[PDB]
């Protein structure tokens, strides 16, 4: 075990009423020396008093906001202690009114700006301030001072003769946070309100924005259908039958490629393909032409009257049927079937039949799509003797 | 015979009211329909939730309370339409008695098949304004469509953002997202079509419509949009310093603490009227309370999102009026309706101070602007000097962001239509020498001349205004119905499709015509030449 050793003692600051004041206290040793902030003030608060511990356990940053005179103005000490030793260092805060601010005091010319940056491109947070004497530039990331002493890292301190700012070469999710700059000289310290920084940018594989929707119309009926694909960079949108490309490829569009269906005849699975340097996607369209119903089931003679015959039949179709057409005629006659139209049930009695004559009955399934094939026929046996 | 309409949250009783014009049929209206839970107490500063259900027949006969706002408090007058500011006393009749429980909307049904739905979002400023002041009954019966005017959380309650989990912000836009979700699942009972929904806004509300098309959440809600004198690219469209003005308000109510969580919970303890009565003056020509980039609703920069193709799905119609920046020079104008050379150079210098914030080499741009907007055919004309000076504020604040939006939408053959309004009504609201100002296209879209002069529009219309308004209403309904302003009802003139190469727009006026490259000489100035003189980043 090693007793605690101060690595960064706090310096006395002088903030403005209604502003912020941030003290820094860090130490090292074995074990990790915990830091307790003991303000020796006649009037103590808790809502402004917030201690922000370092993410690596080195030290803590006391923060008071907003500064209100003369209650926040007191003496603050940093007690770093462990089970081996105990040390303390005190620092003084100075809070003054709005008028006590003299000439040449740190004044924020341009505060931090909201900005979004690319993952690998350069991120630049700008901050301008002027004072007499020339104030020093320091940045705060999430109530914590920004460490830019190392030049080998991605974070760099831009310092031009006019104004200095903050620059980030390669961005990560860690950079996403609140940033606030503040100028500090021998006169005092005046903050500027923070500015949030977001780090999420455009290089996303293409996604289908308007996917192709399947439809059904009577064959022949042309229709203009839409497929839209988006993303950065914008991908080429190509319509594909599954074997050959419908688009000329040479001048294929980008972003949107509406397909014209001419002389609609047979159903087919169409495929809208959107490809980019990042990825390739596919979407299928169930273009189905409205098909005719299959022939109904074989009817059966239920009631056998001399002059009438009752029939019941199966639909034979999984899809609904509008009506049924009964086709009656003599047995071996080559005459076109005399048709009974408008039968809305699966059972119908054919009236008007001449007795003792074998007949042939066929049921026809017809929907909105058209007249389907005729069902299988049947025969009955009625006989009279003279 | 009161009309009854069933919803997913209970039955509503409305009223069949006939329009004063004999040619237009009667319409059914249902006012004060709750589309979300009351954003009070704990629901304050939170995303909207579905509204509670009611068992019986809920009365939809009276007006609902408006959101907390105050017009007497100092607000940026330049953002408001002039018909709003010219009649502040008449507007006060709609703002009286505000309540934090203000999430209600209004529907209009004209009385074959499903009827198209149009959703309106009015925006005087991001702090005031409501849809109750606009009656879309004429547009409903004339176009046989459904007009919807709503209310949403405005001011501090709808846009407070601390940039973290304590207050993400953008609560106002989320209310408009929730409304469209409820309308999409409950308009089929009104005989409306959820697949033919067209959201349209004007002024600041048009800036809101632009943001909704870029949102990830509006995907399956609407299919078309109409933007009128608004953009998501203006300086007041998005607040790029929300934490600063929010903490200044917290110091005014005393709730300013260090933890953003402890202060948000503190603000909900305060009354909703104490927050509105407080006056906060932001940077000039900027907004103090408005939409923010939260990484969810607005994930990136608006222009950045437009290059991604986020809003290419929806059919877009947009356009601007002739002289939008009337209030910019109105104070400088002398009694002779002229601007002097010293007053011209002074007003130009004020322009460079506010928007661009003292860059190095700023003196280079003051004289460049003065050269651009100076008719060398008539250098000493005070009235022409006033004319070009209004065109200055009009080009940079409305015309420049609108053309950039239209090019980024029509870039990949998506249906886009552009207009230019060159007609305004005649009254004492605005000086006679001024042309179509901010919000002057609103009456012609809703067919106000069809009814006559109103308490809010004391204009003295002519027969040419009714003919023009019927033309405008036909273009709007045709676009909301089919995505094409020319189909299916023709004019008794063809509006061509916009593309970045031809740049075809429709000159709307008493002489309707089609021209090209609207003010394109000044457009490339602000988009290409101006930023290069602002890119003094060579020091880096
Ligand atoms: C093709 O699409 C265009 C889109 O403007 C439409 O006008 C046309 O009617 C469509 N053609 C067919 C055959 O549907
Ligand atoms: C489409 O694909 C599915 C499965 O891949 C297949 O069952 C169906 O028959 C196809 N349709 C056509 C018209 O080829
Ligand atoms: C609705 O209002 C009518 C009168 O306008 C009244 O008779 C009725 O009781 C009311 N119903 C409810 C549920 O408030
Ligand atoms: C009011 O209408 C009359 C038409 O009778 C018109 O002459 C007058 O100019 C209108 N008022 C204004 C302020 O324009």
Author numbering:
A (entry chain A): 28 to 413
B (entry chain B): 37 to 147, 174 to 554, 568 to 615
Show passages lifted from the paper:
The X-linked neuroligin 3 (NLGN3) gene encodes the postsynaptic adhesion molecule NLGN3, which interacts with presynaptic neurexins (NRXNs) to organize synaptogenesis. Here, we identified a non-canonical synapse-organizing interaction between NLGN3 and PTPδ splice variants lacking the meB peptide, which competed with NRXNs by steric hindrance. To elucidate the structural mechanism of the NLGN3–PTPδ-meB(–) interaction, we determined the crystal structures of mouse apo-NLGN3 ECD (residues 35–684) at 2.76 Å resolution and NLGN3 ECD in complex with PTPδA3B– Ig1–Fn1 at 3.85 Å resolution.
